[PDB]
Design a protein around this ligand. Sequence first.
Ligand code: HEM
Ligand code: HEM
Ligand code: HEM
Ligand code: HEM
Ligand code: HEM
Ligand code: HEM
Ligand code: HEM
Ligand code: HEM
Ligand code: HEM
Ligand code: HEM
Ligand SMILES: O=N[O-]
Ligand SMILES: O=N[O-]
Ligand SMILES: [Ca+2]
Ligand SMILES: [Ca+2]
Ligand SMILES: [Y+3]
Ligand SMILES: [Y+3]
Ligand SMILES: [Y+3]
Ligand SMILES: [Y+3]
Ligand SMILES: [Y+3]
Lengths: 471, 471
Amino acid sequence: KTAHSQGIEGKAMSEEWARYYPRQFDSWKKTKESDNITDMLKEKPALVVAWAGYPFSKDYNAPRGHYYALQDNINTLRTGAPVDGKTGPLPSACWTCKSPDVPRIIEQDGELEYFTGKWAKYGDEIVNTIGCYNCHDDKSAELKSKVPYLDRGLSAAGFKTFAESTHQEKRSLVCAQCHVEYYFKKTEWKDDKGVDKTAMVVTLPWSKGISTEQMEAYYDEINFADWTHGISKTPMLKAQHPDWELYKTGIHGQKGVSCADCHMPYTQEGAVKYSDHKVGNPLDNMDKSCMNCHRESEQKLKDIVKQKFERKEFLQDIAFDNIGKAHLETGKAMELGATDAELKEIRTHIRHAQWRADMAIAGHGSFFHAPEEVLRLLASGNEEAQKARIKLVKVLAKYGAIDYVAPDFETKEKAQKLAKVDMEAFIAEKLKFKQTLEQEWKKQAIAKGRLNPESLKGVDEKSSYYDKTKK
Amino acid sequence: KTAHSQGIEGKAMSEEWARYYPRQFDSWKKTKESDNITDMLKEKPALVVAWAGYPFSKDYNAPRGHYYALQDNINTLRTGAPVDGKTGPLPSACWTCKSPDVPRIIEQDGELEYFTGKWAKYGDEIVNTIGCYNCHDDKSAELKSKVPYLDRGLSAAGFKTFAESTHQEKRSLVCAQCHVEYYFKKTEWKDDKGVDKTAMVVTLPWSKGISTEQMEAYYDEINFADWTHGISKTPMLKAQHPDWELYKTGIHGQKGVSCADCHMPYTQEGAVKYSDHKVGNPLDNMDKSCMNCHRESEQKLKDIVKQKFERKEFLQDIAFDNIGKAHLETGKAMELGATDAELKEIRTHIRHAQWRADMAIAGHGSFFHAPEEVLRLLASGNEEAQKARIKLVKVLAKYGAIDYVAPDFETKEKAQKLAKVDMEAFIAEKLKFKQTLEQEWKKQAIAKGRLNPESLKGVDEKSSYYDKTKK
Ligand code: HEM
Ligand code: HEM
Ligand code: HEM
Ligand code: HEM
Ligand code: HEM
Ligand code: HEM
Ligand code: HEM
Ligand code: HEM
Ligand code: HEM
Ligand code: HEM
Ligand SMILES: O=N[O-]
Ligand SMILES: O=N[O-]
Ligand SMILES: [Ca+2]
Ligand SMILES: [Ca+2]
Ligand SMILES: [Y+3]
Ligand SMILES: [Y+3]
Ligand SMILES: [Y+3]
Ligand SMILES: [Y+3]
Ligand SMILES: [Y+3]
C-alpha cells in the first residue's frame, strides 16, 4: 500500500502530494521552465483565413508547459471577457483538460452538471493546473483515467477501456484524456430537481474509427459543423490536437512505445525507479528519451527530426495557401451572386480539405509521431483544396471574374483584416476582464482554500498580447 | 590471394567464376526464380499519357530477376526492331547496365567508342546478363565499379570515389553503377584514325546534388529535354530508377545500412561467411534480411511495409491523374489556337510536376527506402500539376472551352489511343525482329564463344506481349 491509502485531503492541489512523492512533485513543477509563447497566427497567418469566423482566428499559440495550462485557458482571447458566471462566449467544457479540479467537480456534481453552463461558471472553482489527480488514484497512486468520455470513445472505436488495457497502454492513455480530437455535443437533460438543462459534452468522434477519414465520415453523417466560415460560408470542422489518434498510427505507437517512454523517461537509482515528470520536449533529454532504444549520435537523431519538420512545413504551407485562396475565391463568387447550389460541391471540397490539413497539423508533434500519415494528410487536403479551386475558376468566370486574384494573407495583420477580427477591441475587453473578474476569481479561490498562491508564481507573465518579460 | 590471382579467362561469362565460387554462383543464378512480368502500363495507364511521344508509352514493366536483364532489354518494345547494326530507335548506351560484356567492351574499345552507334551495334557481342564481372575484380574478387560515369557523378556531387569509399559504402555503390537516374549526353569526339563521331554517353545528373530538386535545376540550367510531349508539346524529363539517390536520403541510408544488408544478407557457416547473391525481394527472406536489426514479428514488419505502399499508391494515383489531365487540357488549348507564349508557364509546371512525380515512383522500392521523401515528392508534383490546371482553365476559357473535360485514360488501351501508340504494328515488327535478327545474334554469339546456351534456359518465355506460360 501507499503512505496515503485513505486518500489525500485536498487532492486537487498537487502540492498536497509532495509529502509522499517529493521527487515526482519536483520534476512535475519544472514544466514551469517551458514558458515560451509561440503565436501560431503570427507564424502561420494562413491559419487566420482558415479559421475566419471562429475563435481560433483571434488567438492560437503553440503548447507550452503544463504549469501554464490553466492560465493560458484564462488568457486566450478565445475565452473572451465574461462579466459574471453567465456571460462569455465559451462553455464550461473548456476547463475539462486544464485542471485536476475538473474530476473533483465531476465526481461531486456529476458529468452533466459539470458540462452545463458558461466557462465563467467555474472561474473561482477550477484554479489548479494539470496535476497529480488528473492521472493518479489518490489512494493507490495507480494510473487512472478521470474523464468518462475517454472510455466511451475507446469502446466506440473497438478499443479496450482504460481498466482493461495493459500497463504500457495506460502509460499513453492517461495522456489521451486530453491529447485527442473532440467536439462538443449539445445534450439535453434534466437534473434531480426536475429542471431541464442543456449541456455541451466533450465527445471523441471515434465511433467509426480513429483515422482522419473515419472521423470525417463521423461528422458528415451527423451533418456536424463547428462553425460556418466567415468568408466562404462553408460548414467547417475544427481539428484539435489529435495527438494520441495519430500517435497510434505511427510506427512508435504500433511498436508499443508509450508517450511516457519519450516524455517521461525513467531514472534508475538503486532498487528504485523514477519517472521524469517534467513533461516537455524529449529532444532536450535525448540520452534518456531516445538513446535507450537507438544506438548512435544525438545530433544525428535531432537532424533527422528536423528533416521531418521541414518536409511537414513544406506541405503545410502549400495546403493552407490553397485552402486560404479557396475560401477567398468562394467569398468573391458569393459577392458576385453565386448561389448556394452553385457552391455546394466547392464548399464540400473545402470542408474536407481543411479537416484533413488541420488534423495533420493540429497535433504539434504529429510530424514526428506519425511522419508519413502527416505528409499524406497534407497532400490529401491540398488535393481537395485544388479540386475546389478548379471549380471556382469556372464559377468566377460565369460571373465575369475569371481573372480574380485572391488577396494576400502573408502577415497576421493582413489575414485578420480579411477575417474581420477586431483585435484592438478583443484585447481591450480581455484586459478589463483580467484586471477585474479574473482577480476576483483568484482572490475567492485562495480565500476558500482551493488555490495555493505559490502555484501562481510567474504563471501570468506572458500571453500572445503581452509579455512582462518572461514566465 | 585468390585461386584466380592471374585473372579469369572468359571473365564476362559468370559461369567461369563457378569453379572458384560455387556457392555464390548458385545463389546468383537463382534470380531466375523472379520471373514475374508486371506490365506497369496496364497497372498504371496514366503513365501512358505521361509518356506520350516517348518509348515508355509503348512498353514499361516492373523489374524482375537479374537473370532476365539482358533478355528484357532485347524484348522491350522500347528497343524496337533493328534490321542490322545501324538501325533501330535506341543507341548503344542501352546495353550499359544489362551485361558484364559492357565493361569487357569498354576496357577493349574505350568508353567513347562503346557509347557510339546504335543499340543493334553490339547485338552479337553483349549477350551475358548481369554477372560477377559487373561487380568483382577478376584477380582479387574485390568489389569494384566497372563504369567510369559513376565516379564522375560521385565526384561532381561531392562524394568520394568508389576507391576512396569504405567497404560498407562499396556494398551499395556496386549497385549504384546501374540503379540510378541518368541521361544520355550527346558527345562529339574523334577516334585515333581521325574519324569524327558522335557518342551518347550515360551521365548522372548529380553536379548540383542528388536531390530531385537539384537534378531538376541541373536539367533546367542546360535546357535539357528527353522528349517533347506528344500531346502537350511540353519539354519533358524522364526519371529512371533513382534507387540509390533516394536510398541515400532515407533513414536506412543515413544510418549506414547498405543495399547488400537487405538484398544480399549474410549466412554464417563456421569460420566462413557467405553473401546471398539471389538479389530479390528482401521480404521473402526477412529472418535474414531484417530480423538481424529488428526484434519483433515478421508479419508485423510486412504489414508496415504494406502500409507504406498503400500511402504511396494513394498519392501516386492523384498526381498522375492531374498530370494526365494537364497534358490533355494543354493539347486541347493547342487545338483551339493557344500560342506557345500563352502556354509557357503551364508547360513549365507540367515539366516540373512530372519530373518530381516520376522521380518518386521510378524507383520501385523508394516507397520503402525513403518513404517520407517519396510522399513529399508526389505531393509536390501534384501541386505543380494543379497549378498548371488552374491556369489551363483560363486559357481554355479564352478560347471558349471552359467546360472541356479531359478524356479518361483508366485502361492501357484507352490511354495508348490518346497517346497514339500503334501497338499492333510495334508488336508485329518486334516479333519479326526476334524471329530473325535476334536469333542470328544468339547463334553468332554462341558460335564465337561469347554466349553459353545454358544461360538461355527459360530466359525468353515472357514479355509484356507474350507468355509461353512461365520463365
Ligand atoms: C501524458 C503523460 C501526457 C503527455 C505525454 C503530454 C504532453 C504534452 C506536451 C509535450 C506539452 C507541451 C510541452 C511544452 O513544454 O511545450 C503538453 C501541453 C499541454 N498538455 Fe499535455 N501531456 C500529457 C498529459 C496531459 C493531460 C492529462 C492533460 C489534460 C489534463 C494535458 C493537457 C495539456 C495542455 C492543456 C497543454 C497546453 C499547456 C499550455 O500551453 O499552457 N496533458 N502536454
Ligand atoms: C474550449 C473550447 C477550450 C478552450 C478555450 C481551450 C483553450 C486552450 C488553450 C488557450 C491552449 C493553449 C494553446 C492555444 O493557445 O491554443 C490549449 C491547449 C490544449 N488544449 Fe484546450 N481548450 C479547450 C478545450 C479543450 C478540451 C476539451 C481538451 C481536452 C479534450 C483540450 C486539450 C488541450 C490540449 C491537449 C492542448 C495542448 C496541445 C495543443 O496542440 O494545443 N482543450 N487549450
Ligand atoms: C503530481 C505532482 C504527481 C505525482 C505526485 C505523481 C506521482 C507518481 C509516482 C509516485 C509514480 C510512480 C513512480 C515513478 O516515478 O515512476 C508516477 C508515475 C507516473 N506518473 Fe505521476 N505523478 C504526478 C503527476 C502525473 C501526471 C499529471 C500524469 C499524467 C499526465 C502522471 C503520469 C504518470 C505516468 C505515466 C507514470 C509512469 C507509470 C509507470 O511507468 O509505472 N503523473 N507518478
Ligand atoms: C502519446 C500519445 C504522446 C503524446 C500525448 C505526446 C505529445 C506531444 C506533444 C503535445 C508534442 C508537441 C509539443 C510542442 O510544444 O510542440 C510532442 C512532440 C514530440 N514528441 Fe510526443 N507525444 C506522444 C508520444 C511520443 C513518443 C512515443 C515519442 C518518442 C518516440 C515522442 C516524441 C516527441 C518528439 C521528439 C516531439 C517533437 C519535439 C520537437 O521537435 O520540438 N512523443 N509530443
Ligand atoms: C526520442 C525522442 C526518439 C527519437 C528521436 C526516435 C527516433 C526514431 C526514428 C527517426 C525512427 C524511424 C521512424 C521514423 O521515420 O520516424 C524511429 C523508430 C523506432 N524507434 Fe525511436 N525514437 C525515439 C525514442 C524511442 C524509444 C524510447 C524507443 C524505445 C522504447 C524507440 C523505439 C523505436 C522503434 C522500435 C522504432 C521502429 C523501427 C524498429 O527498430 O523496429 N524510439 N525512432
Ligand atoms: C547491388 C547489390 C544491387 C542491388 C541491391 C540490386 C537490386 C535489384 C532488384 C531488387 C531488382 C529486381 C529483383 C526482382 O526480382 O524483381 C533488380 C533488377 C535489375 N537490376 Fe539490380 N541490383 C543491384 C545491382 C545491379 C547492377 C550492378 C546492375 C547493372 C549492371 C543492375 C541492373 C538491374 C536491372 C537491369 C534490373 C532489371 C532486370 C529485369 O527486369 O529484367 N542491378 N536489381
Ligand atoms: C536505353 C534507353 C535503355 C533501355 C532500352 C533499357 C531497358 C530496360 C528494360 C526493358 C528494363 C526492365 C523494366 C522495363 O520493362 O522497363 C530495364 C530495367 C532497368 N534498367 Fe534499363 N535500359 C536502358 C538504359 C539503362 C541504363 C543506362 C541504366 C543504368 C545506368 C539502366 C538500368 C536499369 C535498371 C537498374 C533497371 C531496373 C530497375 C527499374 O526500375 O526498372 N537502364 N531497362
Ligand atoms: C557471380 C556469379 C558472382 C560471384 C562468383 C561472386 C562472388 C563473390 C564472393 C566470393 C564474395 C565474397 C564472399 C561472400 O559471399 O560474401 C562476394 C561478395 C559480394 N558480392 Fe559477389 N559475386 C558474383 C556476383 C555479384 C554481383 C553481380 C554483384 C554486384 C551487383 C556482387 C556483389 C557482391 C557484394 C556486395 C558482396 C558482399 C561483399 C562483402 O560484404 O564483403 N556479386 N561475391
Ligand atoms: C541500395 C541503393 C539499394 C538498392 C540498389 C535497392 C534496390 C531495390 C529495388 C530495385 C527494389 C524494387 C524491386 C522490385 O522488383 O520492385 C527494391 C525494393 C525493396 N528494397 Fe531495396 N534496394 C536498396 C537498399 C535497400 C535496403 C538498405 C533495404 C533494407 C533496409 C532494402 C529493402 C527493400 C525492400 C523491403 C523492398 C520492397 C519490397 C516489396 O515490398 O516488394 N533495400 N530495392
Ligand atoms: C528488411 C527488409 C527490413 C525492414 C522491413 C525494415 C523496416 C524498418 C522500418 C519500418 C523502419 C522505420 C523507418 C521507416 O519509417 O521506414 C526501419 C528503421 C531502421 N532500420 Fe530497418 N528494416 C529492414 C532491415 C534493416 C537492417 C538489415 C538493418 C540493420 C543493419 C536495419 C536498421 C534500421 C535502423 C538503424 C533504422 C532507423 C531507426 C533506428 O533504430 O535508429 N533495418 N526499418
Ligand atoms: O483549445 N484546446 O483544444
Ligand atoms: O530503362 N532502364 O533505365
Ligand atoms: Ca474538433
Ligand atoms: Ca533520366
Ligand atoms: Y496534506
Ligand atoms: Y512547446
Ligand atoms: Y518513416
Ligand atoms: Y575456366
Ligand atoms: Y520485381
